[PDB]
């Protein structure tokens, strides 16, 4: 319901309820891992080898074919069983070539239950009795200072939780302009949240056809490995359109020149460095994590006056989200060729 003649100053940067949501989603992410299977019995010597594939010395395969002993239902007996792993999940311990998983020396790992999914469902945050939620209905609003048109509301609108580092996906579009947002633009340690009007459609896919393979560890314990690759061994990627992306970069240059002078050259670059899930944008697509390189998008320079971009991905199977000390998640493989469609909404 609308509320007139009112001037409440807002602040998204010293805002609460983004602090407690960041606490709540981490805590609930942990609460969806207690019924699941621990991979304590799987930290073991691996006897890995190259996958059956045409091999060139210069090129490096992204997959390894690892055989290993594994326990069974019966404590006396054990079984030789093989799986397929990525390069990023195994390291070499040191003729022969025997590996192990990377997280073995720091943390026992937890398989995600394949029954539960990772897709966003929209949360509506609701105020309890004796409080209220105000909403800035203003159009041109950098999130700091007076909002002339506020309105109370029972609950917030649909907030779908996306996990993404760069290029935040499936978000809320702006009304008419493209709005950049910062706490102090003359400072550089604070990020610049960009939100643009017309979304850029991104198409990400994995052309491999995986077969999973249930491996019993113990009584009522199932480890979902990767069986054979059926078809061509290919590299996953994402596609955006060249025209719409160059158009939205033109829009964000046009809006970034409001704070930096009109006679200013604005160029982009790729990331300076860091861990894999901050040098490039990570996301989830149908239950599998992509780390998809963005040096193709953010390469431009701008002067004061049916194609597409194929940008390549990588897939980890273990993750270390929010960088804890003893927590990881072995994401299980999923059947078939996987693809999804998302609307890029904003930037960081």
């Amino acid at each position, epitope marked *: 319901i609308h509320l007139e003649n009112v001037t409440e100053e807002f602040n998204m940067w010293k805002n609460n309820m983004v602090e407690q949501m960041h606490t709540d989603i981490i805590s609930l992410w942990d609460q969806s891992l207690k019924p699941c299977v621990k991979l304590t019995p799987l930290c073991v010597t691996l006897q890995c080898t190259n996958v059956t594939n045409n091999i060139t010395d210069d090129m490096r395969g992204e997959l390894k074919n690892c055989s290993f002993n594994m326990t069974t239902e019966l404590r006396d007996k054990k079984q030789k069983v093989y799986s397929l792993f990525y390069r990023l999940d195994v390291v070499q311990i040191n003729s022969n070539k025997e590996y192990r998983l990377i997280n073995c020396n720091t943390s026992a790992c937890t398989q995600a239950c394949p029954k539960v999914s990772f897709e966003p469902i929209p949360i509506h945050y609701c105020a309890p009795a004796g409080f209220a939620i105000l909403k800035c209905k203003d159009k041109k609003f950098n999130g700091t200072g007076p909002c002339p048109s506020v309105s109370t509301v029972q609950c917030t609108h649909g907030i779908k939780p996306v996990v993404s580092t760069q290029l935040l996906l499936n978000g809320s579009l702006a009304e008419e302009e493209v709005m950049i947002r910062s706490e102090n633009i003359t400072n550089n340690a604070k990020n610049i949240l960009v939100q643009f009007n017309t979304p850029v459609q991104i198409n990400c896919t994995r052309p491999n056809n995986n077969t999973r393979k249930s491996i019993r560890i113990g009584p009522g314990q199932a480890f979902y490995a990767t069986g054979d690759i059926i078809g*061509d061994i*290919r590299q996953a990627h994402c596609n955006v359109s060249k025209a719409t992306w160059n158009e939205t970069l033109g829009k964000v240059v046009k809006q970034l020149r409001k704070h930096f002078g009109n006679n200013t050259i604005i160029r982009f670059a790729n990331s300076s460095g860091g861990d894999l899930e901050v040098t490039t944008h990570s996301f989830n697509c149908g239950g599998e994590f992509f780390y998809c390189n963005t040096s193709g998008l953010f390469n431009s320079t701008w002067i004061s006056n049916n194609d597409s971009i194929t940008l390549p991905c990588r897939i980890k199977q273990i993750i270390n989200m929010w960088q804890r000390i003893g927590q990881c998640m072995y994401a299980p493989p999923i059947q078939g060729v996987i693809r999804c469609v998302s609307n890029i909404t904003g930037l960081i």
Partner: antibody
Amino acid sequence: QVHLQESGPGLVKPSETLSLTCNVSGTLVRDNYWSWIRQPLGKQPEWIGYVHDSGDTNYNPSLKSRVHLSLDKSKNLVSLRLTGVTAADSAIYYCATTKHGRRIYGVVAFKEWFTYFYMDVWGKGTSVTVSS
Amino acid sequence: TFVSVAPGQTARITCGEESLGSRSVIWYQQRPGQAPSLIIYNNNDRPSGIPDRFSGSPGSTFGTTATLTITSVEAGDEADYYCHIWDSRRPTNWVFGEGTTLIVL
């Protein structure tokens, strides 16, 4: 209209460098790839490899050292040198033209393709035999 | 490995290893005493000189064996057939497949 013609010794004493030649008819040596194939009696052929100008000279890695393919741009011929004839080398050998072509199965920029070869016309053969 | 099917009938001549990825097979034939001659240069593509009814199995199929289908056979079809598979996963085959022999009544 092309047809080829090989020429060689036919009688080979062992541990001796075998050499062969191949004439042309119609199409010259620069205009296409070249390839050498061998076939034993009552057997499937064995594609020894291919030669072309500008480094397109990959060999069968089974032999890989005792075989050297060559051209003749002065006289417009093709030639072959072999090294260390054993008893298995008695086979009918073939100079032939071949044509490439890209089988593309995925993204082009990600090198998800390969080039197959196919031999359209052939030579006529030289029944090389090793004997003492 | 000899297959004969009264003249005018059909014949399915298989050759080579079962597929792993995408393939570009090449079919040759060999009249007795002669040189080889190409009949099929792609999975289902033929050059000039060789007529139709010589169909080939496509390379898009995963985990099947390369076949060569002939309808309305003749005594000129009686020769030694050869396959040369080019899989996108296995390395380069510098030697051809196994010699398959056709006979006719």
